[PDB]
Amino acid sequence: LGIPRYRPDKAETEPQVGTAQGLAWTPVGGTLLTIEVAAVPGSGKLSLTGQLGEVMKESAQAALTYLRAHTQ
């Protein structure tokens, strides 16, 4: 077969430092999406890239103010 185009079963993934790994449900059949986040230095502004639905924007706001209930 040739070379392992992945590693084996995913205990070897060795946690990333901020990208979450979401379950997504797609018309090719539901396959993974690891939704990626860049935390940049700045002044407190949001931008959102990547052909996202605005439902994703709203969910970001909801989780975002949930965080703002939990900064303490």
Added chain:
Amino acid sequence: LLAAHQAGIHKIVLPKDNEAQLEELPKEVLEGLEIKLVEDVGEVLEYLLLPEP
């Protein structure tokens, strides 16, 4: 890499994760072309800068 070689360019920077891709090739490709496999962007930017900043 074949685009690089045919242009006579022989000293390449590539992703570490692409170390696996290398072996369906002859030595024709593999020995004119001198590959510096790296996993980060800090690595390639240390390689590709002539002066210090």
